[PDB]
């Protein structure tokens, strides 16, 4: 009996759909979360900024009976995210409107419920007709989970606790909680708040009892403090979680309860020395993530994200930037449990709109790009705070970011620099910048004033995490009062400004908040103790931000991600793994000496194009080869991404010679090689400890190798199976040099989530059991249902057959 199951949905729109007497039984049944945009095909006539998928106007409905014991109680319906411009009705009557696609909210439906036993009905209209109102793919509908909460009239409201730990040592932590208590009875009520604390193994480690008297219709804040001895500290390598169980008592009887998971950890940003987690000075190995996972779209399916994060974590990542909007509660829960530090961003724009198709300031105006900027003046406060009410207990969250690249949207910011920029500092001095800024004409809104209001609102809700922002032009935001509102200046693609921040504003902590997946970005981080990390754009590829010149149909994604749309490890991931992890590691790629970005003359490698050198490489990694399957005798440049200080390369057993990481300024081991069928083997050492990796020439495609991440799942409507298809030759050696059209067949009760191959440059039907491979591989994503049973999975490509998999559903 989960409230998220058995919803009705339709991609239509009629005025009668909310009426007391309208029956939606003819509508399709769905389980939340749901994103309808991915059930529509990739169209050439949709907008590339939102991933070539239309929105439209859609509706949901949900019936539920009033409990037999709904007397002296309240009812709250809670949404964690609905995209967007959504309207809410219960039993014929309007509850309200909610513009923003990413903030959570709730309605008090207590007085609307029909008497004990009888049926109630919620209706949601979603207006995603403005299907280009975003620079990236959004999806459509109730894409995060919902809740139906019943409480006593004396109760902790929704999100009614805030747990903090202002003193943290290894002997003890001071753990404070604020329990709000609302009395919705018509007379005064006396009681007690009992809050019990519990560890990893459910042993009670603390307790506090406080008395209260609260007047009719008033809300009271009860603060309680305890000392937790020898705490298990939450860390990225040891994410231990505690539980606060706060109970409201009348007489001696529990009348309401809230459970507040939390962690005990200290965080500190030091402007001279860097970032400190529980007293360990560590670098932030961050990645940026949008909210979609391809076949599922915006629908928050946890197992799908678990796999992607596990991969990211195996690559060394310890932090996540939620670009450029509030994340899902369930995603933050995943981060608490798995161990990532999380920057949650409130907005992508404030007073003035960005161009949705092109980046930066809005140049054109049309109906379908009309976004949240229309509601920002009235809604920014309610939204920012609700996000924080919802999010603030999660130990993962270590930064609140009030805005991304805002400077583009205000007349005078870019002008007041000297630039009109990636690779230079500004030609104007700090005073000259300030003088230019004073010379610009007054707009209706100011970047500084709005920064202050947002920073101030933020601090009313939480002072235990720093305020930051991703500043694209720090030089001017240092002078407008914007950076002055922040505790941590975040720099979008400004490694060339780290020395400038230290020199000119040393007492303000600074950091990479958006960066390129390249060694030259990380070199700049580890050479500076005052720059504690970076956040790569992006950790995993995402739908949208295409359709521009150079990236026309049928391209869906940019390909800037470390992981592709299937969550498979790309070349850029293995470079970062070679920089972010310590256990010895070698990845072997190559290109034709023609296609390679490097060239050997006199036994020494340099960049081909000196106007495109290694220090200026941008978002998308070159299309390099993992195979060893060229034509005989062709000249090849083997490029290796490794943490080994010495590697020796063998071609069929003949030693090509040892090389040293010290000799390669761009952190890439290189060899010139004359291709002949066989194998390449790299043997390397990282301070004495050895490791070996190799690639093999294969014969033509023989079989389909199928792997499964789990051989058993539960019949809970939510567990995911990820099936990986990989082409192999007669001897089982992996193919990546030719593609095949693979048809999966599955027996037993399952729900298809879909198929992906990781090709950013080409569309495909998500809902087909057939998928073309990319780099010899593909992914099929299935989901458990109500029905237990066995699933028999196999595949073919005409002649080409496969091994057979069996997965139980318990
Ligand atoms: O792909 C380029 C990126 C630049 N910085 C902001 C991101 O949202 C994105 O537009």
Residue numbers in the entry: 32 to 451, 459 to 848
The authors write:
replaced with W657 and C598 in GH2C, respectively. to specifically accommodate the β-linked AHG residue. generate AOS products, which are substrates for GH2C. AOS by GH117B and GH2C, respectively.
determined the three-dimensional structures of these four agarases. initiated by GH86 or GH16B, which generates NAOS. depolymerized by GH86, and systematically saccharified by the exo-acting GH117B and GH2C enzymes. exo-acting β-d-galactosidases, while GH117A and GH117B are α-1,3-L-neoagarooligosaccharide hydrolases.
